[PDB]
Amino acid sequence: GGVRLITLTSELKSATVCASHFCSSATSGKKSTEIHFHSGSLVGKAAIHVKGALVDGTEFTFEGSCMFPDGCNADCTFCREFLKNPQCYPAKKWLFIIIVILLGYAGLMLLTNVLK
Amino acid sequence: CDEMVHADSKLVSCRQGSGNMKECVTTGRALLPAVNPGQEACLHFTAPGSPDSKCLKIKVKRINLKCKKSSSYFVPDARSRCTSVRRCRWAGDCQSGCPPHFTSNSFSDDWAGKMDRAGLGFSGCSDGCGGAACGCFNAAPSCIFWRKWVENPHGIIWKVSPCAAWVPSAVIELTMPSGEVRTFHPMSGIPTQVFKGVSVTYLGSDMEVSGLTDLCEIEELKSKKLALAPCNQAGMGVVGKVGEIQCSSEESARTIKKDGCIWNADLVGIELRVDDAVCYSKITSVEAVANYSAIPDITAIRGSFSVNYATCTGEVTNVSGCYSCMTGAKVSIKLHSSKNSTAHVRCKGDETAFSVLEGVHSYTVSLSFDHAVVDEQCQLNCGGHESQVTLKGNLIFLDVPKFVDGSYMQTYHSTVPTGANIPSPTDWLNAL
Amino acid sequence: KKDGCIWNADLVGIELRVDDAVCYSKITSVEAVANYSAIP
């Protein structure tokens, strides 16, 4: 979940009433595109939301009456407004970050001689 | 509740019914911004007496586009039935000229007057048969009275309302500070005033609006499904509309006995013959006739309330991870109180207020906030001020630290930085 | 109390039941109903 509308959900029903009532949303203002779906047989259901949380526990009140699921989620697109992150520094890691610059140009110099 | 506002306690009228706990009743008006969907918004109440205070939360659940029921009518299912009592002159002794007046309710020719299973059916004479062909040996013509019945043997009933508009609305839960809760669907797009208990809420921010054609809902009583149509509706049945008979009694919507619903003139297709009349009709069903579709800053005003009136420790337990997420980090604090009391704001919390409730036991309440760094100091929670501070690294929407693949790309980006300038400097003198 | 202002016919949403009547309405507030502009 997030901005993208697609999520993976695995729920099952144990009922035989042809009439299926509403369903609900998840946390942070959802509106699931499939609230009613036939409840005659044992057909598994996969809804779509934009939650993207860790536990991602929600509820619905048509017949299930506010159950409490659990979850755990952990790595997505690395785009962010902020740049990098705060570091320990102190001249011990910055020195290792900076390396020789002529070494990179040395590799390109060898290619030119071979081409000629 | 990330958004919280205290009461305007300048209105003080508090009577000391009991010394130990006070009593007070006030009123006024409130102005609250709308909270993000799926969340609840709190409301702090302040009192001159330090120990005691109350609160009120309002939870929103959904956003949708409905419209209010301006009117209401029922539509039964008409069947055009007709009989014919066939007299001939000197046998029924009817006049040479058919009586222009007709009692459409009594019908004394057949068992005087009783209940007519039609709703105000019409009446009339007919042309005449005379001679041995029809048997009563009068050469003069014959008068024939006819009926027309509108009947609903196994009715299916729809209720309709022509709002003919579309205004945003939300789902609202109310929680009276006494502890009582009330649910209601307020039309917060309009300045509607839903009346409940003491307080009333009204309009919110119509941050988006949209248009749709003249459409109203069509719903069936047994709840087969939910239907939509051009849904034309008025106090009378205009020609070509969806609803011809509009009847304001569900208990009388099965049959037709109530006078509120009115027939349409000459709607029943009565036609005559040489002996007796026969029934037809030109009525149209709700379906396959006029159908274009097929369904598969909130604020409140204050009234005359019933506002009611020691040791406590905060003792935080943990911290979760959020900054710049529309939900916030859910942080739990395990408290014990000798009294059922409230918590209040943390000044250096620097984000928002608190409306925590505790029972008389060591409970924990977890609440959602966000901050770049953890400060959590100077909370005037309960009874007396306390100053507990935590330490934990917040989780914010950043890049992926799992593999650090961007580090390799960062080093390759800074390549031959001085080489380009060195070559350009030599060419700069010639170009200039 | 003043007679100068006149009600609208059947404006109040009265509806009946088996014992007693209950109140509703279809009135609209001035705001969020017919509004195209907002002065600073």
The b/e string for B225-259 (b: 16+ C-beta within 10 A; e otherwise) is: eebebbbbbeeebeeebbbbbbbbeeebbbebeee
Query: 3-class SS at B62?
Result: strand
Task: Provide the 8-state DSSP code for B422.
Answer: T
Residues of C in contact with B205 (CB under 8 A): 32
C39 to chain B, minimum CA–CA distance in Å?
Answer: 15
State whether residue B424 is helix, strand or coil.
Answer: helix
Contact B191 C26 (CB under 8 A): no
Three-state SS across chain A?
Answer: CCCCCCCCCCECCCCCCCCCCCCCCCCCCCCCCCCCCCCCCCCCECCCCCCCCCCCCCCCCCCCCCCCCCCCCCCCCCCCCCCCCCCCCCCCHHHHHCCCCHHHHHHHHHHHHHHC
Question: With contact defined as beta carbons under 8 Å apart, do B229 and B286 qualify?
Answer: yes
Give the other-Cβ count within 10 Å of B115's Cβ.
7
Q: Give dist(CA B212, CA B206) in Å, integer.
A: 16
Selection from A48, A54, A2, A31 nearest residue B326 by Cα: A2
Report DSSP letters for B144-170, one per residue.
EEE--EEE-TT---EEEE-----EEEE
Rounded CA-CA distance B107/B56 in Å is: 66
Distances (CA, A) of A50 to A26, B243, B303: 8, 42, 40
Report yes or no: B258 and B270 within 8 Å, Cβ to Cβ. Answer: no
| Token pair in block for residue C16 | 């009946």
Rounded to the nearest angstrom, the minimum Cα separation between B70 and chain C is: 5
> How far apart (Å, rounded) are the C-alpha atoms in residues B396 and B325?
8
What is the rounded distance in angstroms from the CA atom of residue B205 to the CA atom of residue B183?
Answer: 20
Distance from CA of C4 to the nearest CA of B (A): 24
Residues β-bridged to residue B366: B332
Q: How far apart are the C-alpha atoms of B45 and B9, rounded to whole Å?
A: 8
B395 CB within 8 Å of a chain A CB: no
* Angstrom distance (rounded) from CA B70 to CA B112: 43
Residue B187 backbone phi and psi in degrees, to 5? -80, 75
Radius of gyration of chain C (CA): 16
Choose among C26, C27, C32: nearest Cβ to B203.
C32
Pick from B102, B217, B89: nearest CA to B162: B217
What tokens appear for B302 in the block?
């204050």
The enclosing H or E element of B93 equals none
- Give the resolution value in Å: 7.2
Strand order in the sheet with B226-229: B73-75, B158-161, B216-220, B226-229, B293-294
- Which two tokens mark B54? 């109350």
CA torsion sign for B120, B121, B127, B129 is negative
Contact B162, B176 (CB under 8 A): no
3-state SS class at B411: helix
Q: What are phi and psi of B368, to 5 degrees?
A: -105, 125
Work out the minimum CA distance from B416 to partner chain A, whole angstroms: 7
- β-bridge pairing B384-386 and B379-382: antiparallel
Burial of residue B412, with CB atoms counted within 10 A of its CB: 0-12 exposed, 13-18 middle, 19 or more buried: exposed
B249, closest residue in chain C (CA to CA): C16
- Residue B176, φ and ψ in degrees, nearest 5: -65, 140
Measured distance CA(B182)–CA(B201) in Å, rounded:
12
- Using CB atoms and an 8 Å cut-off, which of residues 305-344 of chain B contact chain A? 326-327
Identify the experimental approach.
Answer: cryo-EM
Check if the beta carbon of residue B177 is closer than 8 Å to that of residue B197: no
Chain B residues whose CB is inside 8 A of the A84 CB are: 399
Phi, psi for B301 (deg, rounded to 5): -100, 145
Tokens standing for residue B321 = 């991870």
- The β-bridge partners of B81 are B149
Cα–Cα distance for residue pair A75/A78, rounded to 1 Å: 8
Q: CB distance C28–B190 less than 8 Å?
A: yes
Say how many C-beta atoms besides its own lie within 10 A of residue B148's C-beta. 24
Sign of the CA dihedral with B237 first, then B243, B244, and B247 last: negative
Where helices occur in B236-366 by DSSP H, the ranges are none
Contact, B258 vs B112, CB < 8 A?
no
Interface of B with A in 27-56 (CB under 8 A): 36-39
* Gap between the Cα atoms of B153 and B284, Å rounded: 17
CA B28 to chain centre: 27
